[PDB]
Amino acid sequence: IRWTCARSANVYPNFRPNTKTSLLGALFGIGPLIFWYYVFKTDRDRKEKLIQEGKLDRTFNISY
Amino acid sequence: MNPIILIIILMTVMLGTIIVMISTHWLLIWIGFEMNMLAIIPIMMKKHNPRATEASTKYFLTQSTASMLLMMAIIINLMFSGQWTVMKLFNPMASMLMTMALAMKLGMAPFHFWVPEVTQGIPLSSGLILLTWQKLAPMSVLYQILPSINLDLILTLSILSITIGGWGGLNQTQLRKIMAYSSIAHMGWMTAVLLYNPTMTLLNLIIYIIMTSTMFTLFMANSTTTTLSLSHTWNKAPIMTILVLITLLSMGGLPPLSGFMPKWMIIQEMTKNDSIILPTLMAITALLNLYFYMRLTYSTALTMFPSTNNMKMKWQFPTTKRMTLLPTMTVLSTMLLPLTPILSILE
Amino acid sequence: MSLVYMNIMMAFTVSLTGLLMYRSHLMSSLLCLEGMMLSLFILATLMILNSHFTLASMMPIILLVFAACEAALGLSLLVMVSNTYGTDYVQNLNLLQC
Amino acid sequence: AKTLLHQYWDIPEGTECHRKTYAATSIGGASGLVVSAYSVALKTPTSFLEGVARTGRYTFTAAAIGAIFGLTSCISAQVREKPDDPLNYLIGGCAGGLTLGARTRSYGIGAAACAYMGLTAALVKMGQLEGWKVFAEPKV
Amino acid sequence: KFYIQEPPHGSPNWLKVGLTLGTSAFLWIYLIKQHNEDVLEYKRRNGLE
Amino acid sequence: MMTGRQARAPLQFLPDEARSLPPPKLTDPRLAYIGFLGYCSGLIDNAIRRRPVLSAGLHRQFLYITSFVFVGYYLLKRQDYMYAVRDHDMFSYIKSHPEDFPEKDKKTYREVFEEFHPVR
Amino acid sequence: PFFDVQKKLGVDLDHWMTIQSAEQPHRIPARCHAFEKEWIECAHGIGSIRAEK
Amino acid sequence: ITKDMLPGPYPKTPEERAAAAKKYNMRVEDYEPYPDDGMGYGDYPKLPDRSQ
Amino acid sequence: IARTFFDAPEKNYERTMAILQIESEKAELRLKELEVRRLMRAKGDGPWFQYPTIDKALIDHSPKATPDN
Amino acid sequence: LLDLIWLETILPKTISLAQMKMSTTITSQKGLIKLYFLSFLITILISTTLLNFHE
Amino acid sequence: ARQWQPDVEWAEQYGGAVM
Amino acid sequence: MLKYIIPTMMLMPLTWLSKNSMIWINTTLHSLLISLTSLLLLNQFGDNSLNFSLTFFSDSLSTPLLILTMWLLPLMLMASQHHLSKENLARKKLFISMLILLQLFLIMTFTATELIFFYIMFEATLVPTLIIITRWGNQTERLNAGLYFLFYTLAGSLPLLVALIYIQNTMGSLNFLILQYWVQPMPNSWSNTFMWLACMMAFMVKMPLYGLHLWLPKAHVEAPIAGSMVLAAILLKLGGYGMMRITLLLNPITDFMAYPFIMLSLWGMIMTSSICLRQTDLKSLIAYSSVSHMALVIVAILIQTPWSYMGATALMIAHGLTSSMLFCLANSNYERVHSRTMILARGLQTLLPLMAAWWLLASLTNLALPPSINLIGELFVVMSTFSWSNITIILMGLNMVITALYSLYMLITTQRGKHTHHINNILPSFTRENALMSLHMLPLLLLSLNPKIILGPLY
Amino acid sequence: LQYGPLAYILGEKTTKKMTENSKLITVDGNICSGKSKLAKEVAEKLGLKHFPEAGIHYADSTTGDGKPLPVRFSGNCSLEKFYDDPKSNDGNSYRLQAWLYASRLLQYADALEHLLSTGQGVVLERSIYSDFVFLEAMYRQGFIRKQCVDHYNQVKKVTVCEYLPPHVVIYVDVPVSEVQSRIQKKGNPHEMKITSAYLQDIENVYKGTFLPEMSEKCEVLQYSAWEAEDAEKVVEDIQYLKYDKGPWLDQDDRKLHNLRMLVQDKLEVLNYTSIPVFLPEVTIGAHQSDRVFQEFTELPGRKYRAGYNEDVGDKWIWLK
Amino acid sequence: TLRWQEDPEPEDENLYEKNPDSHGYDKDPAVDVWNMRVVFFFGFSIVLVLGSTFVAYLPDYRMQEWARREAERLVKYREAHGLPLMESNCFDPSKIQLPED
Amino acid sequence: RDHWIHVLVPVGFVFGYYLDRKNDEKLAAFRNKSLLYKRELKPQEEVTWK
Numbered sequence A: 001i002r003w004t005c006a007r008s009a010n011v012y013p014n015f016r017p018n019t020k021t022s023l024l025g026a027l028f029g030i031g032p033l034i035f036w037y038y039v040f041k042t043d044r045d046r047k048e049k050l051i052q053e054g055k056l057d058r059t060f061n062i063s064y
Numbered sequence B: 001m002n003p004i005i006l007i008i009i010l011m012t013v014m015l016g017t018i019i020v021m022i023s024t025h026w027l028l029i030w031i032g033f034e035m036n037m038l039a040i041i042p043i044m045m046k047k048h049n050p051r052a053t054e055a056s057t058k059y060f061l062t063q064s065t066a067s068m069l070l071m072m073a074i075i076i077n078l079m080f081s082g083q084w085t086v087m088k089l090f091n092p093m094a095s096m097l098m099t100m101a102l103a104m105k106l107g108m109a110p111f112h113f114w115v116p117e118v119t120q121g122i123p124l125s126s127g128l129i130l131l132t133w134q135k136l137a138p139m140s141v142l143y144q145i146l147p148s149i150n151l152d153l154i155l156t157l158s159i160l161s162i163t164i165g166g167w168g169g170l171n172q173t174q175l176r177k178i179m180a181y182s183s184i185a186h187m188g189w190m191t192a193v194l195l196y197n198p199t200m201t202l203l204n205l206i207i208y209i210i211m212t213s214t215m216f217t218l219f220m221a222n223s224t225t226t227t228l229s230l231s232h233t234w235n236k237a238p239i240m241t242i243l244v245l246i247t248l249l250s251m252g253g254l255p256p257l258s259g260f261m262p263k264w265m266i267i268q269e270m271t272k273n274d275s276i277i278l279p280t281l282m283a284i285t286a287l288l289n290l291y292f293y294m295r296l297t298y299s300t301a302l303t304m305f306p307s308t309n310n311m312k313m314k315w316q317f318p319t320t321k322r323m324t325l326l327p328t329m330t331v332l333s334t335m336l337l338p339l340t341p342i343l344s345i346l347e
Numbered sequence C: 001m002s003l004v005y006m007n008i009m010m011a012f013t014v015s016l017t018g019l020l021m022y023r024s025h026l027m028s029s030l031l032c033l034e035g036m037m038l039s040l041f042i043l044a045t046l047m048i049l050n051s052h053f054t055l056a057s058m059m060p061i062i063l064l065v066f067a068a069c070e071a072a073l074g075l076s077l078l079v080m081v082s083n084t085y086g087t088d089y090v091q092n093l094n095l096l097q098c
Numbered sequence D: 001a002k003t004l005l006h007q008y009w010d011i012p013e014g015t016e017c018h019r020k021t022y023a024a025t026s027i028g029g030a031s032g033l034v035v036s037a038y039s040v041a042l043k044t045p046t047s048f049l050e051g052v053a054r055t056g057r058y059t060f061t062a063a064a065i066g067a068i069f070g071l072t073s074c075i076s077a078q079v080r081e082k083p084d085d086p087l088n089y090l091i092g093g094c095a096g097g098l099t100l101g102a103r104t105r106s107y108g109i110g111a112a113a114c115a116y117m118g119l120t121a122a123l124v125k126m127g128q129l130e131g132w133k134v135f136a137e138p139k140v
Numbered sequence E: 001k002f003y004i005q006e007p008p009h010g011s012p013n014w015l016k017v018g019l020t021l022g023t024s025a026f027l028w029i030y031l032i033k034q035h036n037e038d039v040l041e042y043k044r045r046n047g048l049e
Numbered sequence F: 001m002m003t004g005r006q007a008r009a010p011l012q013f014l015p016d017e018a019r020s021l022p023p024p025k026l027t028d029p030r031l032a033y034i035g036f037l038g039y040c041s042g043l044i045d046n047a048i049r050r051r052p053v054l055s056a057g058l059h060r061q062f063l064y065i066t067s068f069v070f071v072g073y074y075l076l077k078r079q080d081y082m083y084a085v086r087d088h089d090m091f092s093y094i095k096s097h098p099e100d101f102p103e104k105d106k107k108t109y110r111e112v113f114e115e116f117h118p119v120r
Numbered sequence G: 001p002f003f004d005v006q007k008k009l010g011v012d013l014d015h016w017m018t019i020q021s022a023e024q025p026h027r028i029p030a031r032c033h034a035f036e037k038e039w040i041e042c043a044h045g046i047g048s049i050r051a052e053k
Numbered sequence H: 001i002t003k004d005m006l007p008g009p010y011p012k013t014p015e016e017r018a019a020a021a022k023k024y025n026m027r028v029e030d031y032e033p034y035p036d037d038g039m040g041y042g043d044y045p046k047l048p049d050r051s052q
Numbered sequence I: 001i002a003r004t005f006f007d008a009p010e011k012n013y014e015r016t017m018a019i020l021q022i023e024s025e026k027a028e029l030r031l032k033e034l035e036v037r038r039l040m041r042a043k044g045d046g047p048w049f050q051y052p053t054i055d056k057a058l059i060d061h062s063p064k065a066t067p068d069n
Numbered sequence J: 001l002l003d004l005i006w007l008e009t010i011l012p013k014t015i016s017l018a019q020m021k022m023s024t025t026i027t028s029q030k031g032l033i034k035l036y037f038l039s040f041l042i043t044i045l046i047s048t049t050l051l052n053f054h055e
Numbered sequence K: 001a002r003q004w005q006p007d008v009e010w011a012e013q014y015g016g017a018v019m
Numbered sequence L: 001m002l003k004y005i006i007p008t009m010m011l012m013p014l015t016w017l018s019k020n021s022m023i024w025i026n027t028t029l030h031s032l033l034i035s036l037t038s039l040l041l042l043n044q045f046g047d048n049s050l051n052f053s054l055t056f057f058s059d060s061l062s063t064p065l066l067i068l069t070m071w072l073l074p075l076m077l078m079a080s081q082h083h084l085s086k087e088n089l090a091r092k093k094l095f096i097s098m099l100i101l102l103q104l105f106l107i108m109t110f111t112a113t114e115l116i117f118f119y120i121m122f123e124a125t126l127v128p129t130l131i132i133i134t135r136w137g138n139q140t141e142r143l144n145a146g147l148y149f150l151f152y153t154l155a156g157s158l159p160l161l162v163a164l165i166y167i168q169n170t171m172g173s174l175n176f177l178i179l180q181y182w183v184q185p186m187p188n189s190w191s192n193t194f195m196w197l198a199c200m201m202a203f204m205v206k207m208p209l210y211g212l213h214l215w216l217p218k219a220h221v222e223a224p225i226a227g228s229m230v231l232a233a234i235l236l237k238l239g240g241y242g243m244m245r246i247t248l249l250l251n252p253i254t255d256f257m258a259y260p261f262i263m264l265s266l267w268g269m270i271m272t273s274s275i276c277l278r279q280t281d282l283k284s285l286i287a288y289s290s291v292s293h294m295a296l297v298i299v300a301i302l303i304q305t306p307w308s309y310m311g312a313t314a315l316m317i318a319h320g321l322t323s324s325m326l327f328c329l330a331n332s333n334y335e336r337v338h339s340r341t342m343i344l345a346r347g348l349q350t351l352l353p354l355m356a357a358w359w360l361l362a363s364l365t366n367l368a369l370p371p372s373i374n375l376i377g378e379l380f381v382v383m384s385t386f387s388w389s390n391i392t393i394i395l396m397g398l399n400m401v402i403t404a405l406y407s408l409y410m411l412i413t414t415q416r417g418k419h420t421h422h423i424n425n426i427l428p429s430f431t432r433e434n435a436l437m438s439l440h441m442l443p444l445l446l447l448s449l450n451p452k453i454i455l456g457p458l459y
Numbered sequence M: 001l002q003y004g005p006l007a008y009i010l011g012e013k014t015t016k017k018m019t020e021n022s023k024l025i026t027v028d029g030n031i032c033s034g035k036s037k038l039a040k041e042v043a044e045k046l047g048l049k050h051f052p053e054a055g056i057h058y059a060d061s062t063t064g065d066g067k068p069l070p071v072r073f074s075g076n077c078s079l080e081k082f083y084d085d086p087k088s089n090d091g092n093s094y095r096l097q098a099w100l101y102a103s104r105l106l107q108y109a110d111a112l113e114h115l116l117s118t119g120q121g122v123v124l125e126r127s128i129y130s131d132f133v134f135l136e137a138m139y140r141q142g143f144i145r146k147q148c149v150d151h152y153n154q155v156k157k158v159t160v161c162e163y164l165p166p167h168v169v170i171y172v173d174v175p176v177s178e179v180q181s182r183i184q185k186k187g188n189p190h191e192m193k194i195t196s197a198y199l200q201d202i203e204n205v206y207k208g209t210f211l212p213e214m215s216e217k218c219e220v221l222q223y224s225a226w227e228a229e230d231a232e233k234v235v236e237d238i239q240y241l242k243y244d245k246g247p248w249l250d251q252d253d254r255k256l257h258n259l260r261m262l263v264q265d266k267l268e269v270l271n272y273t274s275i276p277v278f279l280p281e282v283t284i285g286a287h288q289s290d291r292v293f294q295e296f297t298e299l300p301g302r303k304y305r306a307g308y309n310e311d312v313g314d315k316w317i318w319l320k
Numbered sequence N: 001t002l003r004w005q006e007d008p009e010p011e012d013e014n015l016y017e018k019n020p021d022s023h024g025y026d027k028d029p030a031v032d033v034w035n036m037r038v039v040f041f042f043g044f045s046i047v048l049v050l051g052s053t054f055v056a057y058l059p060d061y062r063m064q065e066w067a068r069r070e071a072e073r074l075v076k077y078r079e080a081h082g083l084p085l086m087e088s089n090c091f092d093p094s095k096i097q098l099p100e101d
Numbered sequence O: 001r002d003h004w005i006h007v008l009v010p011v012g013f014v015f016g017y018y019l020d021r022k023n024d025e026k027l028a029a030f031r032n033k034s035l036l037y038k039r040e041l042k043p044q045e046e047v048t049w050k
């Protein structure tokens, strides 16, 4: 019971916002999100630009 | 507390309020206001304790200052108009002075500083009277002067009153101070809508009057004044705990209860006049109101607070108080939603 | 309008700025209330007597009497404080805050 | 202090830094004066000197907030060559939040003030562009 | 008997019971008569005869 | 917002022209809902005084139902009269001023342009 | 709201004091009796908005 | 269960560490809490990081 | 199953048609209500939004003591 | 790091902390009527001059 | 086992003059 | 829909008039009869919706949700009739009353013709769930979970109210059929940006979206079994149905608007699934599995492709049934061992063979084993998202690992290994529990044969 | 509700029945002072109604059948256990004293209601103005703590201040040795277990705190052990008294009407008795309170109001 | 000191000791057997079996099968008159007015 | 009856079902008027659907 309460409910009352926790939250909390958003925006822009100029092979693609 | 004298005093209060309602002259409006406050002074000195004297002194000082401002507005209106019909004023200073005079009378923030104190120091019947019947007459006065009301001043007073009432009720643990700050927030809520459609103002006034009457009737019936005795009441009558739970659920505007009727329809008259940020802000402050309401129901019925030993004698005696109009006002404050368009009778 | 009108407004604002930021007991507040009384009475009487509104001579006298009774009520309130704390000071009015 | 808002909005965004800076500084000074006056009226000062010290602290803090926010919004609007962008007001609001956090001797409060003041300045730009009216005149 | 003291609500107040019954009957027949008169005036006004 | 309509006959709950409308039936669903509210009020009154809820105070429950159904019928009549006034005034001012209400030529779909945004 | 009891039961209480151009004892004229008479006859029964416009 | 048999904040002085070691039923020397980096470990001791 | 329980497709079709017509009429009436409220509040010459003025019946038409009025 | 601390910190806990802090600042009056009337004077002066509510 | 109910600590948290 | 509301309003006195020993049997019999009569809503068409009146209609989308709701309520009464055997008769009848009122509220909400009626009924669903959570919950801190749930819902739904009233005042109506025929495109403006945010954030709160999902790992744990089931299997799908209705009105802004939100799920459903790799509480593991499935639903609805819609509704129904079964399994194990710790009770297969079989079937249906409904829905979502973009297959494919990597893990630690020594109160399987789990499982395996009725409105 | 303000409007004046013989007389003494019969003699001398000492089951006796309810339903405290272990862990001492003060307050409310309504004087034993002399005798013997003492002081301060003291009080002076000898000759198997220091403390609080204020706020008479037997001397002494002290002089019809309204609401009398002050000798948690409340609701005659119980044989329940 | 008065923790109720053939429903055996009968009749025998019968025999769901039959006509038309299999325009191009530019 | 509660809901079902048919009688403004199903009424048939 001590281990479960230390793992579950006693993590926030013993938290102090400092530079280490802020850096680890900025590196892991929003970094993957902005990286994924940028790579997906680039890929979708490339796909839309290829489609609107009529070069992508979409002849038999009728399920979407 | 001679019953003849109490009956005569209550009839004087009713006569003063109805004189404010039915008159066509500014002097008679002030006459009704003065007779109403003069006859409501003995109501807050019923129990004869020094806290009541303190509360009545503060109330008299604030109401007399508001009345002197009211004559300042009337005399300025006479100067600039030469006539006395209760209608739109003929001077911006008259409208401004009248607006904060009625704000002082109604406990609208930042002129609200007497409302959480006075209601703390008076008996619960006098608190019910002050928070229910006193608000009726200056609503009529503000309704009859709406063409000349400055939009900026009444909007600033409304938003300040709503925010201040919510944030002040967020901290108090006494029932009367919570009731006072809730009344302040509801006053701001139903004065924000006045310039666009006063039928919504009248509907919110009637709903707030009924719901506050139910709350005060339950508080006098349970003989509870603080949070702890209201928690302790679950040994005596659980049906009263269920009733206070459902009407406090209704008090925060949670559907399908009656308290969701006015404010939502108030928003129905905010987007007609192209205003979007304002109902959102007052809805967030209503969420603050619902937070301390939820705290009250958590203390009252949704938990089971530890009691004392003497409850057993209180289990051998039924409630002998004159629980008057409690079931009708409880039903009318919870299940009135499918009869929403009844507000058409208030046009 | 006339200059005496503006003098009465300035007098009423003087009574207003004296009624709010007091330091003494409640008698000063009631005296400033009577200043508001007197300023409103003189202004109403001057207005009624200048524009020849004959009927509205009912306005000034009534404008006293009602609030005069209200003023009497205030005196009784002070007596209550004089029967409770000995002195009617406003700094003793700090029992309802808690 | 209504015409001061008009004079703040009469200067186009990202054109002249000086007058926008003094207009925002005067707005901040007025807001700090109102807050300090209400604080002195409600909370009784210990003496005259401590009261005017609190008044000067609040007034200078709010004036610095206004000046920093206006200056940062103007330099960002100049460096982006786009007056019609809420990004400049977001950057200015974050600069104001950072200055408030530095004045209050805090950093988490400074980051929260960055976020909330940037969002508020962005919404101010939103209302300026799309004509949002929170104080709407009665139309119907 | 079970209770040593006689309760105030031990016996039914026959005057109040008769008053409630008479008030209910009067209000019911008044509502019915009012509805009949209003519907008769409606059909006479709009000619649904 | 009808301050200039009822001013000719003030303090009239149900005027004479309200008799020109079809009165609501005694089997109106709103009226039965108000009767249910009266029955619920009687049940609450029996419950808060520590009485048998479904047996005690039958005459009390019948009086509650009767009073609620009476006031509900009259309030429904006033609501119907008010909304008849509302849409009658709407139609009257629409008929009186057809310069501010032009007849829009409803074009067909054969020539109007709707912008298409493909989804992919 | 504005309940009109006086217009309902047809009894005057304060209509005589309400305007300066009303009837007064011995028909003593005010300074601006004609101006108020013309203003009221201009602004009767047409609404406050059209009266002020 | 009871409140003082449950984990709390990070101990600093020797007697709080001794009370924590009594609660966690180790020696006062074998009780090595995690460093106060503000992560939320509390007064939970650091075992030598070995598999079962 | 189709005979005992389920309704005919034509019945559902025409019921949907009537429902759609009723709701379209209600929407058009609501839009007309908003437009007429805006226009006649802005102009102020309609049955609603008529803020009261002073009644003209209270003026005394009798001659006065001084004729210069 | 994220689902128990930071996500708990951004939306709900900062809001709750600001709410309780400014609620404690609002309800910390000394009950003196003189301070209330002085605040009334400051409000009236601000409305008459600094906002110009009577134009 | 059984459902938990508030003890003396919760009441004394809610029992003060200021919460 | 007045043929189903009146039976529930007659079920209300049916549980207020029975004896103290006959409430459960009568309520179960009549609710199962109503569930039998619930199948008449399947008279649908491939091109038209079944409309009854001006206020109630039901297409091929709301019909499976209705059937699931009034099939789940008798299961709720079975699951919650043992741990309340010590309660007062009045409180037991109040519990049944709240459950019946909640079912009535849900069946009135799912058939709302106009959107404002749907909104008010959607907020009206708050009251009995909050009452159940804050009254009949077991743990100490249930008040915090109830407050978090109520405030997340209300703070989401009030801008939804403002946007709905603005839309009604702008165009003229809020009927779904009229809005289907009176739809207007929304240009790329900041006013339309905040309109989209106000119309979406309520449903992203109740789905829940990753980042705003924090009300789930609390309110799913400390609540009782009936409250856990109504939180896991209905209300998230209520938010999904609302988002499906609303997203018709917000084209074509969403095509450039839903880029963060989709990806706020497209990473989040990874790491939340990783949280299930390191969870000591079984109910929290089930709640985070629900979070991952609802994130998949968010992606499918927000990309607004047809195959995504079919996968969304199929995964909705399958995940609701599977999560209800898993919550019942957690409740039964917690009743037997009096602790929610997963590492405590081990080796339950050697003592409970039939319960181990039910655990295996539930875990297999959780990891999308074909040809179950969950595999069909998740496969359709993966096809649709691969049509949207290529690289996102990775963001789904790795999830295909991690889901198994917790679910069979949940199957291992609770069932496989040497049994605990000091635990000696493991009773044999109750017939009530076995009946409840068979009633949870057999409809899923039967609908695996004929899934064409739960594939959406556009099949 | 029978008596209300409408009756006072209609002419129900309470000083119409307030003759010179309507006197509130309470008698005090030690543990076994022998006053118990003496007041009975007064009940056959001035014609006054006499009320016995308020026991544990007094509130059980006044309502319902009057049968003694079991100690679980009412009281949860026994005098035998107090005589056994005064310093017990469960705190029988302060719980018994608080319950007995509540029962005495109920008895005094009933006595005041009877005196105000019927106009007949009432004789009591050990009224609520003479109960703290027990509790202080506990605290000087270490039988309770200081928190219990100040909680009892708060309860007395919020309860007594709405009532008037009796007209004449009579204290019987029996010394400690006589009290112990009378206890020994009485034959109760559990009454010798108290130390004589408790009786000495009762006498000390009586002659040090009770008498110095009942010599001022009311009329006081004092008698020795043998002079209590002579009833004619006592009734001649009380009948030849000159009432000048006490607030019974300045009582108009309005104040007595308000007192009659307040004493006819039994909830209002005992509303401030059980204030929410959590002292571990009197507070009981939710589970036991719920269990004993659901058990008391199942008792015959107590499930509903007194006129609405079918299981005890009340007819026309459906016409009320 | 001692805290507030409270009952000790009640033990869990082992139902099989007081009844060897109980089923986790109720103390008394008769109402327990009635509960078993009603759940297994109205849960498996009544709703599941008749529900499978009902869903197995919906009357040509969504007209979808009918559509196939309609297709069985339509190509039969378009393979007789020499028309192309399927037009690339859903509506008639002769009734479309393009916006002139 | 001794088991009257057991027939409280099914009767309350069918009556509600009856009300639906009554509601159908309020939505017959386009009966035999739709363009797909506009046909001449057959003899001994008063309506296309009741």
Ligand SMILES: Nc1ncnc2c1ncn2[C@@H]1O[C@H](COP(=O)(O)O)[C@@H](O)[C@H]1O
Residues within 6 Å of the ligand: M030, M031, M032, M033, M034, M035, M036, M053, M054, M055, M079, M097, M100, M134, M135
């Ligand atoms: N603290 C106390 N200890 C014992 N008995 C008490 C106490 N307080 C009141 N009593 C009552 O006083 C009675 C003694 O009075 P009596 O024997 O009638 O002269 C006892 O039998 C108890 O009912």
